[model samples]
Target: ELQNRLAQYETSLMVMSHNGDVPVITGFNVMRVTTMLDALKVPAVAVLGDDAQDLAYVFGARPLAVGVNIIRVVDVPGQQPSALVDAELGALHEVSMVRVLNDIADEQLVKANM
Candidate 1:
């Protein structure tokens, strides 16, 4: 069931597999790798990732990637990162990142029981 939905939205997903053993990868990696950030200027856009690498490129906002067995989105207050380590957005100070590992651990536990 989940796999089907995932395949349906494959082109627009940013996934970090559970356990981090798989190393989070996106369906748009090649596109991301090929295109630079300065090229996009739209009203609204969406991006997802474990790290800030992809979002920082598109002037897009980064939400805290929350969840464990089933990943969902969340927020990290008082800790918004400013783009990648040393990208253009980093220089401009318009990027944000999250560093609170396992912040959503509790949520994941409850969700599993339910």
Candidate 2:
């Protein structure tokens, strides 16, 4: 069910595996990506394996690819990120990354149990 929804929304933007592996491709238009972000409220935007610095060419905001699982997203400049992005970004730097990591681990465990 989750997979279907992701596929429907991401469409040409991404291809996510059932186990949650996503491949990142360059050259996506910044405006379009922002539009998707507005609609989806996703936790992050890309895989860490990609060169996040390179993404700066397309985005005005800095793209941070962090955490062990590499939850990636563009940090909203001078403003709080969306809720899920805030959680993953440690409330826009108010909290420690370690806390965010532990939270992500706990959530994954709960999801697996479910």
Candidate 3:
């Protein structure tokens, strides 16, 4: 129930979390799913793992047409995720699991951060 509080802020949010379960970037494989950013209006998702960058690509739709970096923040939980890290992670996982679109349609994908 506490985590639900995060949903109130629809604009943007950031959350800092622990080293445990630090998202791992297996390969360019992250590109398989990163376009939800535009559909849901999320901006960026950041953590202490390089793998996160790879995931950004899938949601970002290969911004450069080259490769996707993990630094993109499609959904900022806020400056201090201390109170929302758990919820943030849960939310991202839910979206990433089933969001599959062929192309972001040029302007359909989130702008994404470097």
Candidate 4:
């Protein structure tokens, strides 16, 4: 199932230790996260939630996330994002977020209907 596969790849959110500041909660390392992305085999990454954005904002990885672009989460496919956001693990740049989001969504849709 998509849900299980999603969880299998995205492990627990880790709490990173800071020197002076409070604990910084974040996801896994770049390589690990990218490994998950590659497994998904999708063209884009959708970091939809606030905490998810926190991970994206910090990672700031465009060349690695394995996704072409970072995009907002939408309820339906092909829906226009008011603004395209960058900073996914793969860090695809401004143009590719929508492409990944659409690709991920399309596959998810297929899985559901299948």
Give the Cα error of residue 109 in candidate 3, in Å: 8.2
Give the whole-model CA lDDT for all candidates, comma-separated.
0.28, 0.31, 0.30, 0.33
- Model 1 misplacement above 4 A: 1-32, 36-85, 91-101
Kindly list the per-residue Cα lDDT of model 1 for residues 3-82, writing each as its tens digit.
Answer: 44434333232222111122222222211121223213211112323354654443333323421111222232322222
lDDT of 3: 0.30
Tell me which residue pairs clash in candidate 1.
81-95, 81-96, 81-97, 82-95, 82-96, 83-95, 83-96
Please provide, for model 3 over 1-114, each residue's C-alpha lDDT reduced to its tens digit, 9 standing for 90 to 100.
313322322233222232333333221122212233432332233342332443333333443442332222323222222233333344343222111111222223334531
Collision pairs in model 2? 45-72
What's the count of clashing pairs in each model shown?
A: 7, 1, 25, 9
Which residue segments of model 3 deviate by more than 4 Å? 1-10, 14-42, 48-93, 97-114
Give, for candidate 1, the lowest lDDT window spanning 10 residues: 15-24
- The candidate maximizing lDDT is 4
Per residue, candidate 2 scores C-alpha lDDT tens digits across 9-55 of 23422211111234232322222222323323343333221222233
lDDT of 4: 0.33
- Candidate 2, superposed: residue stretches over 4 Å from native: 1-42, 45-93
TM-score, structure 3 vs. true: 0.18
Q: TM-score of every model? A: 0.24, 0.23, 0.18, 0.23
Q: Write the per-residue lDDT of candidate 4 for residues 1-114, one digit (tens) a residue.
A: 545534423442221111121211122121112233432442123323223444454445542443332332223333333221232433422333233334446666888998
